[PDB]
């Protein structure tokens, strides 16, 4: 159905085989999260694919996609569900040959509900 509000840990692996770990938080249609070198935000327009903006705050550590500016990721809705496990294929906007595979694991609901 529709993805659960709460806190998720994510694992991601790119086509250039770099991998990394982060957290992700969903609060309604708002998606936010980050890892050791970059952070991300997006809104669920709930009718399209989700555009996720990736911002680098630590350039001493390379992007798993080895992009050294801000970029956008495409996440398709089709695969999002209310399960406690999720697997996602997310490519760079305007370049399908560049991508990350995400495994999301649900940890906990949110403290103030809806």
């Amino acid at each position: 159905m529709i993805m659960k509000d709460g806190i998720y840990s994510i694992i991601f692996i790119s086509n250039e085989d770099s991998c990394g770990e982060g957290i992700l938080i969903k609060n309604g249609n708002m998606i936010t999260g980050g890892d050791i070198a970059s952070v991300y935000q997006g809104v669920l327009s709930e009718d399209e694919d989700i555009i996720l903006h990736v911002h680098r705050y630590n350039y001493e550590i390379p992007s798993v996609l080895n992009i050294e500016q801000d970029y956008q990721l495409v996440i398709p809705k089709k695969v999002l569900s209310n399960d406690n496990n999720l697997t996602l294929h997310c490519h760079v906007r305007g370049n399908e040959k560049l991508f990350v595979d995400v495994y999301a694991k649900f940890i906990e609901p949110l403290v103030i509900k809806n």
Partner: protein, 88 residues
């Protein structure tokens, strides 16, 4: 995977974090992320986590940890100094 410095060649069997700690002890100096990744041929994400994990194994490793200006490049980084290691 990782390489073992000639400094500690004869410890091949020990887990990575013991191996790193022992190497650190042999430097007798404040070690950062970049020092470790360099010497063990691993990437920086991995190097960071190793420091984090070591700092949580107090029954094995006796150390200090400061968070300090470098560069700069007006930022601070975690550095670690490893007194010694227990293998019994």
């Amino acid at each position: 995977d990782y390489v073992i410095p000639d400094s500690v060649k004869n410890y091949d069997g020990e887990p990575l974090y013991i191996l790193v700690s022992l190497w650190c002890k042999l430097q007798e100096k404040w070690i950062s992320r970049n020092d470790i990744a360099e010497a063990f041929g691993i990437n920086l994400r991995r190097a960071s986590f190793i420091i984090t994990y070591i700092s949580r194994r107090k029954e094995k490793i006796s150390f200090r940890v400061r968070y300090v200006s470098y560069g700069n490049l007006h930022y601070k980084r975690l550095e670690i100094f490893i007194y010694d290691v227990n293998l019994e």
